[PDB]
Design a protein around this ligand. Structure first.
Ligand code: SF4
Ligand code: SF4
Ligand code: SF4
Ligand code: SF4
Ligand code: SF4
Ligand code: SF4
Ligand code: SF4
Ligand code: FES
Ligand SMILES: [Mg+2]
Ligand SMILES: [Mg+2]
Ligand SMILES: [Mg+2]
Ligand SMILES: [Mg+2]
Ligand SMILES: [Mg+2]
Ligand SMILES: [Mg+2]
Ligand SMILES: [Mg+2]
Lengths: 143, 141, 589, 144, 227, 453
């Protein structure tokens, strides 16, 4: 069986070129879902990094529309060509981040949202984003 | 190794697995009613009107009976959390094997038959899916 | 004119006639973004305006749609009479390529309207459904039973004050609804279903034909009244495939509702989301580029070919004898592979977006479509000649359930039912939509009678034209965007929202709260795989629809069945059901 | 506003120079000789008018730096199509009444007045294809 | 006397065009998955027989609705707090259709008499310290102080003292001090208060260990911490 | 009092600006720096509407809605092509320097800048150059600080300093490098600084108490509730998600706390999320605790209470009108004891007597901003009920408004009203045992014992 690169398949969470997970827990995929089968909570790493505390997707309701993947602004969640096993209890069809978080970057290999964002994390400082200038202090001498 | 499925597919799930037998062992080689059935396959949306029909077709078949709930509409409601749809076949029928998708591929039904017959005679499948580095980009064919 | 601007049709020869015959105060013409003049008639002048429209130089000879609307909670209703509920009648005329939408205002207490079942006979089921979903009674209806919900229902779903979500499951109510069926399968009284009680010496068996049969795409529970083995009267019993899809449009934003449009009537992937997307584009004010138009017509042609192949094969096989055209299903799978390579979803693609399309076509769709257009034509020719030279088909299905232009007009029949009587009315050619006008394809019609054989032959030569449209699409696909640059396109082209803050803000708000469509009303009528269906959206200025009315064709095609087969045998009814292209999800929405 | 050599004979008073397009300010003229690139001079003026502003109103505070950056790119040779048409849009939207004070209406007078008379020296800097995105890998760009 | 609390808000069965008022935005997310870890069969939405609101979105929250109890401000295109412009008749004015409150009493015709009781001048007693109430916004409320966020914000316990009376003892600016009011012997640091009248001591009212009832009472003995 | 907006003819109060009147009529004009409580300053320039005259001037002039008097013979047009383009370009200029972080912003689906960017129909970036960046400050344990997202609308500074009299927040720098924060890291001293989380249109000032356990606005579940940390009835709207109170937002009430809360009420809500709160009725069988049902608890309690020689009840002054009553009914009228000390109650019923039986009108919380003189005799109003302190602060600025209205200055031009005042205030005489927070504005403070006061 051959499946198109097209996402339809089994939702999956990916990681950026680094080791860190892509998701930033903004809830843009949880609200765009027609069915309402995504439910997460944002937690904050020590320095500044947003990440999902728990991520949970009800696969007994998911219709695999692909609206979630289309809404995610950080390319964290994607639809990959593979089907879920048909579980026995229906309770075991609720995936909880541990199951979903893949080891790789998925379809888009080099995109790093936090290289674009303007807020500081451990990696990048205030003036180290993409197309950004070093912060000029108001107490400067230059006019 | 003897199952004669009575496919109760209502909605687009039915016409999606219209060729379910293709991936079958005993059927399609002779040697069709719920009165002599062993396996019921609920595939389409479970409406508040078809529910008595489904329940009576369940009580007509005899006790060594296993029901498979295909699709995301039979499992739990669906995208249709609406006033006229029962929110899952398991609300009134004890399901044995669930299958996700909208609609699921015939491979899913084949694998469901195998997985159910293995009950008589993610955690177990997580390592493979969890750790895949890269995928084919959506730009070719 | 941008082809979507709010315009009242005061320069339309029909409102001038309505003014000449009723005076310039009997109605108020509303300015909408539909293509039809919306006049607000009074309840008392309804039956004398409808008949006047029916009797004209070039009359309005089809009632296309008739449903209510709940206005109790509607802020932006300027230029409209005071109303709580309202019923609208969209009358189609064919001799002049024009439509008109009458409207009647209603109060919550005095909630009733005279019945249209005397002018246009295809208003029986429409009024039954309007009374089922809204509490609007119709004074003078033959029988006004609930058609979509069971008779034991208590509320009226489509009202505003009715929760649109499933309620706690009721096992004892399921128990009662299951036991009472098996018990009261005892007296199929003619009076409740309107069957006049027979003669008491004929077959009073009242066979509830096919509660679950593969000929009809669903339960459909048709009830029969036979005298010998003839039918003398039959009433269909629908409602068994009704997932609330018009009330769901009021719970989902303009963007999230697209998968529901796909499920409205399966077998057609993008054919069903084309009218919704074009109607919400009218509501927004978007004019998609040429590339989007050609992409949409290519996808809808692929799905039309798919559904036509399935229908032809199923009828040929189900008549009793057939050549092993096992492959046509193989070709269906092939088309599905193409749709999967393009949209990524195969079945229910949910590809069409507001103001464009989800992705730009894949890099290798050219060869993918060219191999298909080189593999299909000879197969279809074989397909056309085997279905014609098969005399068993021309014997078992010829003159089985025949009606003429008059009946097809008065029962709301469209598609291949119509257009086989000789009424060359096709939406692609009459009212071109989504850059349909730029293709060369002749619309096949029939001569006089319209029976099963003629309908099937028409759907057969309705394939070569779809293949010609596909070949033209492949030969000249314009270069340009796949999403119209417009502040309301949904959502903004990804590669920009991933790196630009304005586009990110737009995408954020459009997928979180939904796009804000300004207050207005829109309508789009297309030619579906089986008949004509259209979306009549009403935006109250919010981020979701205030009302979504889907006119599906299989409704009227099923309503016509009792009139079409009276004095015919049960096998005639079976081949009739096998010939009218209909789906039960299409019927019940 | 800049003025060419033809306007050199009109009397130095408010009405005459006001009708000639320019405006008599402190009546202390400046003569720009041929060896001065106009884009460099207008950049030197707009960077003063942008760095010397205050922060109160958006059109000045946030639009003068954009003109400064466009002019730096034009004098470096990294202009792009839509630059001069973006500068001209700044001369209409920073005019009198659109900003809180008169600093920006006068700040954008030499710019438009140099564009009018010497557009060639501004176009000569546009040597790039407009591009603003970075081509994310898995997304196909929206074409034109 | 409370006959006016019946009009403070409409009772249950109050509907807006049949609909009851909504507690959640229309696009409330994660409805079939936010309770999935406990059980995948989602429960019925909770029933609110008490009031006119529903614990769901199947309700009504429109700017032009004819009620004065608004759960939140949202209008199409105006997501933020600025959505309160659509809910008031004139922006910055009262909420359209009035404001949700009923004064129980209205000003009387005739007033009280003059209270002919002037208190005598405060003369400080030797060996007794009248407690002057010092109230803090953070930490002076019984329930707010329990918030783990106010622990960072609330001040440290202290006992303010007049310099003329801090120097009268040996205590200086930060020395702990023990004092007895009842059975309890509290020991708090000392801060100098130049504005406080001499024969008084300050105490943070409400702050744990000091009951607000300790306002006007006099602690009988105060001395150094006796370490 | 009869303006013409886009051909239509409306009736407006001719005493307020065109932005206020057009927003009261239901029309949609974008605006960042106007606030219906802080007057109008023409800083952001984003509420531009074309203004004609003669009803036949076909070439009007762009003018800011919030600064034109909206007099009788006024002809404007919100939808003019030039006005549309200017309003759009005005947000484009703000977007030139914005940080690509909506996903990580504390306020998505709640941001006013997102609303106005989607409203002006701007969804395409022509800017190409670098953005200016800023370093943040530590403002306290309540509200955060992300100066990258500032659009320099001046609402924070105007509110915090001219309205609430903060004295430790202002603007620094100039020329597109402007900065709004504290002079140095440290906690914000003002009691009413929480309102900066909603006064600021962008996500620069966002509260930490919600930022820790965050949830987008749509996910929240609100209900009309009343602040319970103070004697005033400030109308709040607390939001819940995943079964715990996430934040407390302000709920407009044009008679009590129109737009502003305290910090004790906005941030002191964390006592409902405690993990030690009682969640089931338990019984102490000697030394052990056994969890009971609801019916079990009621049956047991009634069985023990029915065998009692007398049952008394002690209600509190923080329950509700029913909870106390309900209890009163359970124990008898006689056995119901108000859970406050004798002296705590005597001077509570005396205050109630002064309010009821004393023929003097007790103003609402917003009517306090309309009184000439104030005598705060014995109360630390800032620390006990602080919204009354903000209302008094608004009342003492009344003399500047009188001086401005005597010179025919409109009541929405706040800059001119303040400039005409020049630290001239109505008399206010506070009185307390020690210094207060209303001494900077008071004419004289009396520091003395509660007998000398
Ligand atoms: S999956 Fe995507 S949209 Fe959802 S929270 Fe993570 S980054 Fe946001
Ligand atoms: S693809 Fe599945 S999980 Fe994602 S939005 Fe659609 S239904 Fe929900
Ligand atoms: S699960 Fe999907 S394909 Fe199957 S019946 Fe339901 S909506 Fe149709
Ligand atoms: S135009 Fe004037 S007021 Fe506006 S920012 Fe420039 S100097 Fe300041
Ligand atoms: S302040 Fe508003 S526009 Fe700016 S990043 Fe945050 S949410 Fe987006
Ligand atoms: S910090 Fe906020 S309120 Fe202050 S100027 Fe910037 S955007 Fe406006
Ligand atoms: S003044 Fe402050 S503490 Fe008192 S009720 Fe209002 S918000 Fe709550
Ligand atoms: S709101 Fe009027 S200038 Fe900013
Ligand atoms: Mg309750
Ligand atoms: Mg005013
Ligand atoms: Mg920093
Ligand atoms: Mg810091
Ligand atoms: Mg500083
Ligand atoms: Mg903020
Ligand atoms: Mg009671």
């Amino acid at each position: 069986v051959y499946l198109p690169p097209r996402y339809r398949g089994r939702i999956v969470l990916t990681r950026d070129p680094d080791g860190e997970e892509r998701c930033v827990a903004c809830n843009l995929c949880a609200v765009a879902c027609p069915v309402g089968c995504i439910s997460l909570q944002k937690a904050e790493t020590k320095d500044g990094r947003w990440y999902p505390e728990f991520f949970r997707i009800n696969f007994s309701r998911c219709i695999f529309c692909g609206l979630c993947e289309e809404a995610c602004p950080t390319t964290a969640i994607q639809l990959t060509p593979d089907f879920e096993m048909g579980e026995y209890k229906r309770q075991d069809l609720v995936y909880e981040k541990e199951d979903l978080l893949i080891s790789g970057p998925g379809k888009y290999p080099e995109y790093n949202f936090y290289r674009m964002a303007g807020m500081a994390i451990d990696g990048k400082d205030k003036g180290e984003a993409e197309n950004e200038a070093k912060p000029i202090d108001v107490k400067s001498l230059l006019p | 190794n003897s199952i004669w499925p009575y496919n109760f597919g209502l909605s687009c799930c039915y016409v999606e697995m219209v060729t379910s037998f293709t991936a079958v062992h005993d059927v399609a080689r002779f040697g069709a009613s719920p009165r002599q059935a062993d396996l019921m396959v609920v595939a389409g949306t479970c409406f508040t009107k078809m529910a008595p029909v489904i329940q009576r077709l369940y009580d007509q078949m005899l006790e060594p009976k296993w029901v498979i709930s295909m699709g995301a509409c039979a499992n739990s409601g669906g995208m249709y959390d609406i006033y006229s749809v029962v929110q899952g076949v398991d609300k009134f029928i004890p399901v044995d094997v669930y299958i996700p998708g909208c609609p699921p591929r015939p491979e899913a039904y084949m694998q469901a038959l195998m997985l159910l017959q293995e009950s008589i005679g993610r955690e177990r499948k997580r390592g493979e899916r969890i750790a895949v580095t890269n995928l084919r980009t959506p730009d070719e064919i | 004119e941008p082809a979507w601007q709010t315009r009242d049709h005061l320069d339309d020869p029909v409102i001038g006639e309505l003014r000449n015959r009723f005076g310039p105060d009997a109605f108020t013409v509303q300015a909408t973004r539909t293509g039809v003049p919306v006049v607000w008639i009074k309840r008392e002048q309804l039956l004398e305006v409808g008949d006047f429209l029916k009797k004209l130089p070039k009359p309005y000879v089809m009632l296309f749609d008739l449903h209510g609307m709940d206005e109790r909670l509607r802020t932006h209703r300027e230029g409209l009479p005071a109303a709580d509920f309202s019923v609208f009648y969209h009358l189609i005329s064919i001799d002049r390529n024009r439509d008109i939408m009458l409207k009647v205002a209603l109060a919550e207490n005095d909630l009733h309207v005279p019945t249209f079942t005397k002018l246009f006979p295809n208003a029986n089921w429409y009024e039954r459904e309007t009374w089922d979903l809204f509490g609007i009674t119709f004074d003078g209806h033959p029988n006004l039973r609930r058609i979509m919900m069971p008779q034991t229902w208590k509320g009226h779903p489509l009202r505003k004050d009715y929760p649109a979500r499933a309620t706690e499951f009721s096992p004892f109510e399921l128990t009662k609804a299951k036991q009472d069926l098996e018990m009261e399968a005892l007296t199929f009284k003619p009076e409740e279903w309107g069957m006049k009680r027979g003669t008491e010496n004929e077959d009073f068996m009242f066979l509830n034909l096919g509660p679950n049969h593969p000929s009809a795409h669903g339960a459909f529970r048709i009830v029969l009244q036979l005298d010998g083995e003839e039918i003398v009267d039959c009433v269909p019993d629908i409602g068994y495939h009704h997932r609330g899809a018009e009330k769901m449009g009021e719970r989902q934003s303009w963007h999230s509702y697209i998968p529901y449009t796909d499920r409205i009537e399966y077998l057609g992937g993008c054919v069903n989301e084309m009218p919704y997307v074009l109607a919400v584009e009218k509501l927004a004010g978007i004019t998609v580029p040429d590339r989007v138009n050609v992409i949409r017509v290519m996808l809808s042609e692929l799905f039309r070919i798919n559904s036509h192949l399935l229908y032809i094969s199923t009828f040929i096989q189900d008549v009793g004898a057939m050549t092993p055209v096992f492959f046509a299903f193989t070709d269906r799978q092939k088309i599905y592979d193409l749709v999967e390579a393009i949209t990524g979803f195969r079945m229910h693609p949910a590809w069409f977006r507001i103001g464009g399309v989800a992705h730009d076509l894949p890099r290798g769709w050219d060869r993918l479509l060219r191999e298909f257009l080189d593999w299909m034509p000879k197969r279809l020719a074989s397909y056309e000649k085997a279905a014609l030279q098969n005399t068993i088909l021309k014997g078992r299905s010829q003159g089985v359930a025949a009606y003429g232009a008059k009946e097809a007009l008065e029962w709301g029949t469209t598609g291949a039912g119509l257009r086989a009587t000789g009424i060359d009315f096709d939406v692609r050619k009459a009212r071109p939509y989504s850059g349909y006008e730029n293709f060369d394809f002749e619309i096949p019609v029939g001569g006089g009678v319209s029976d099963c054989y003629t309908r099937v032959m028409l759907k057969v030569e309705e394939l070569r034209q779809s293949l010609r449209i596909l070949e033209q699409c492949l030969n000249n696909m314009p270069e340009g965007p796949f999403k119209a640059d417009h502040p309301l396109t949904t959502p903004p082209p990804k590669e920009r929202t991933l790196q630009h803050i304005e586009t990110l803000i737009t995408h954020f708000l459009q997928v979180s709260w939904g796009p804000v469509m300004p207050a207005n009303e829109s309508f789009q009528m297309i030619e579906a795989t089986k008949g004509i269906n259209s979306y009549y959206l009403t935006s109250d200025g919010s981020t979701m629809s205030y009302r979504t009315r889907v006119r599906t064709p299989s409704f009227a095609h099923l309503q016509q069945i009792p009139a079409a087969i009276r004095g015919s045998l049960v096998s005639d009814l079976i081949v009739y059901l096998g010939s009218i292209d209909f789906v039960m999800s299409d019927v019940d929405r | 506003d800049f003025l060419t050599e033809a306007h050199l004979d009109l009397p130095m008073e408010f009405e005459s120079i006001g009708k000639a397009g320019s405006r008599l300010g402190t009546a202390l003229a400046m003569a720009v000789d041929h060896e001065i690139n106009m884009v460099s001079l207008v950049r030197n003026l707009e960077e003063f008018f942008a760095r010397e502003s205050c922060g109160w109103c958006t059109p000045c505070r946030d639009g003068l730096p954009w003109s400064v950056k466009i002019l730096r790119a034009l004098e470096r040779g990294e202009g792009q199509p839509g630059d001069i048409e973006t500068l001209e849009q700044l001369c209409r939207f920073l005019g009198p009444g659109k900003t809180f004070c008169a600093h920006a209406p006068g700040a954008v007078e030499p710019l438009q007045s140099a564009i009018k008379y010497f557009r060639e020296e501004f176009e000569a800097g546009i040597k790039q294809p407009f591009s603003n995105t970075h081509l994310i890998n898995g997304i196909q760009p929206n074409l034109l | 006397e409370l006959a006016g609390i019946k009009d403070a808000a409409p009772d249950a069965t109050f509907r807006i065009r049949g609909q009851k008022l909504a507690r959640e935005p229309h696009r409330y997310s994660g409805r079939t998955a936010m309770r999935a870890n406990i059980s995948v069969h989602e429960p019925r939405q909770p029933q609110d027989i008490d009031t006119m609101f529903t614990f769901s979105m199947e309700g009504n929250n429109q700017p032009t609705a004819h009620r004065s109890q608004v759960p939140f401000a949202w209008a199409p295109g105006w997501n933020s707090p600025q959505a309160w412009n659509k809910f008031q008749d004139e922006v910055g004015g009262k909420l359209r259709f009035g404001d949700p409150g009923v004064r129980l009493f209205e000003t009387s015709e005739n007033g009280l008499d003059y209270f002919t009781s002037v208190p005598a001048r405060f003369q400080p007693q030797d060996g007794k310290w009248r407690i002057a109430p010092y109230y803090h916004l953070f930490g002076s409320d019984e329930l707010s102080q329990r918030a783990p966020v106010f622990q960072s914000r609330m001040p440290q316990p202290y006992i303010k003292l007049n310099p003329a009376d801090a120097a009268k003892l040996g205590v200086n600016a930060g020395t702990r001090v023990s004092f007895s009011y009842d059975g309890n012997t509290v020991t708090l640091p000392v801060e100098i208060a130049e504005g406080l009248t001499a024969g008084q001591v300050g105490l943070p009212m409400g702050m744990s260990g000091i009951a607000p009832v300790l306002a006007g009472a006099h602690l009988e003995d105060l001395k150094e911490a006796q370490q | 009092a009869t303006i013409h907006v886009d051909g239509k003819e409306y009736e407006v109060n001719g005493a307020d600006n065109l932005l206020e009147a057009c927003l009261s009529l239901g029309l949609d004009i974008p605006y960042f720096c106007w606030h219906p409580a802080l007057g109008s300053v023409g800083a952001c320039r984003q509420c531009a509407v074309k203004q004609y005259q003669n009803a036949e001037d076909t070439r009007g002039r762009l003018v800011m809605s919030c600064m034109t008097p909206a007099s009788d013979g006024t002809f404007i047009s919100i939808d003019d092509e030039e006005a549309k383009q200017f309003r759009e370009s005005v947000v484009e200029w703000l977007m030139t320097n914005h940080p690509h972080d909506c996903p990580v912003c504390e306020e998505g689906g709640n941001c006013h800048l997102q609303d106005m960017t989607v409203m002006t129909g701007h969804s395409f970036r022509r800017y190409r150059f670098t953005k200016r960046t800023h370093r943040n400050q530590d403002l306290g344990p309540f509200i955060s600080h992300e100066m990258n997202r500032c659009i320099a609308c001046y609402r924070c500074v105007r509110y915090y300093k001219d309205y609430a009299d903060g004295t430790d927040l202002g603007v620094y720098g100039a020329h597109d490098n402007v900065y709004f924060g504290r002079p140095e890291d440290g906690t914000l001293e003002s009691e009413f600084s929480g309102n900066l989380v909603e006064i600021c249109p962008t996500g620069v000032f966002t509260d930490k108490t919600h930022s820790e356990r965050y949830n987008r606005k749509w996910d929240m579940q609100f209900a009309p509730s009343i602040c319970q940390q103070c004697s005033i009835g400030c109308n709040i709207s607390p939001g819940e998600r995943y079964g715990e109170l996430r934040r407390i937002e302000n709920r407009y009430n044009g008679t009590v706390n129109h737009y502003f809360l305290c910090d004790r009420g906005r941030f002191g809500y964390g006592y409902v999320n405690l993990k030690d709160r009682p969640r089931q009725p338990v019984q102490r069988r000697g030394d052990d605790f056994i969890t009971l049902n609801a019916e079990q608890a009621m049956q047991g309690a009634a069985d023990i209470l029915r065998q009692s020689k007398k049952v008394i009840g002690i209600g509190s002054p923080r329950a509700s009108v029913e909870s106390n009553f309900a209890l009163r009914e359970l124990v008898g009228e006689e056995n119901f004891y108000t859970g406050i000390a004798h002296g705590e109650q005597e001077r509570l019923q005396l205050a109630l007597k002064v309010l009821r039986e004393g023929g003097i009108y007790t103003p609402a919380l917003r009517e306090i901003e309309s009184y000439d003189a104030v005598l705060v005799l014995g109360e630390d109003v800032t620390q006990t009920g602080a919204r009354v302190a903000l209302a008094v602060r608004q009342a003492v600025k009344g003399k500047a408004r009188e001086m401005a209205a005597a010179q025919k200055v409109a009541d929405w031009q706040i800059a001119a009203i303040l400039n005409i005042g020049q630290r001239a205030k109505h008399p206010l005489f506070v009185t307390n045992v020690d210094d207060t927070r209303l001494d900077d504005i008071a004419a004289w403070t009396y520091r003395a014992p509660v007998e000398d006061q």
